[PDB]
């Protein structure tokens, strides 16, 4: 079944020019233990009203405000750098209906409800029509997700371990990292 790891390898995969045999066998052992982590998240679904984005001259420091609404309330939020980076990709245009996950930082454009007449020649949100959401703006949800022990060691190994999870450039992780990860 799902959510139980199954690391199937052949015998000749141990011999490598970058890892030792003991390190490769340790990584193969540690890829087969899953850590199931429970997290708390907040979901926001509402019609976008106002977006104010203040950036520096070089475009480095970015901050701003977002006024979002549903049929019952009206909330003004402060935005960080990653949230404005999410808003700038797949641009939202003040009258769309989007979704917000606080713990994941996901931007999902559900659609458009305002149906503006005046539209610039470019852009064009021929997004499917959707009603404006009603009820509570913010909802709490317990989510769960599985990671492996080897991913924890690779992430905590150095500065850019998430790239090394895909490039495989995790060369001879020290023992102190594994002891601290076991204790944590």
């Amino acid at each position: 079944g799902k959510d139980v790891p199954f690391t199937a390898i052949a015998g000749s995969e141990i011999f490598s020019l970058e890892l030792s045999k003991t390190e490769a066998l340790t990584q193969a052992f540690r890829k087969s233990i899953g850590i199931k982590i429970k997290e708390e998240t907040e979901l926001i679904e509402g019609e976008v009203v106002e977006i104010q984005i203040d950036r520096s001259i070089t475009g480095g420091h970015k901050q701003g405000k977002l006024t979002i609404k549903t049929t019952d309330m009206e909330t003004i939020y402060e935005l960080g750098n990653k949230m404005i980076d999410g808003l700038t990709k797949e641009k939202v245009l003040a009258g769309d209906v989007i979704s917000i996950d606080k713990a994941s930082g996901k931007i999902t454009k559900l659609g458009r409800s305002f149906a503006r007449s005046r539209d610039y020649d470019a852009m064009g949100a021929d997004t499917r029509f959707v009603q404006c959401p009603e009820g509570e703006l913010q909802k709490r949800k317990t989510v769960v997700h599985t990671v492996s022990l080897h991913e924890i060691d690779v992430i905590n190994s150095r500065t850019q371990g998430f790239l090394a999870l895909f490039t495989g450039d995790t060369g001879e992780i020290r023992s102190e990292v594994r002891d601290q990860i076991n204790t944590k």
Partner: protein, 66 residues
């Protein structure tokens, strides 16, 4: 914030709870004001090995230089 004068490393604790709380969108945590004065001298008891000092001096990280 939290500035350690030995190495110059700075830790950002989070937003103060004197201001508003629920108007954020970046899953931050909120911390009250620290007790005591701004300038402090404290005693931390640390356990270490000689190999840790060897790999710290072999690959120097921790300073504020290039």
């Amino acid at each position: 914030i939290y500035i350690e004068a030995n190495t110059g490393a700075v830790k950002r604790v989070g937003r103060s709870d004197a201001y508003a709380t629920e108007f954020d969108l970046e899953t931050e945590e909120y911390v009250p004001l620290p007790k005591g004065e701004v300038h402090k001298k404290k005693e931390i008891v640390q356990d270490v090995t000689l190999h840790d000092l060897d790999v710290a001096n072999a690959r120097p990280q921790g300073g504020q230089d290039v």
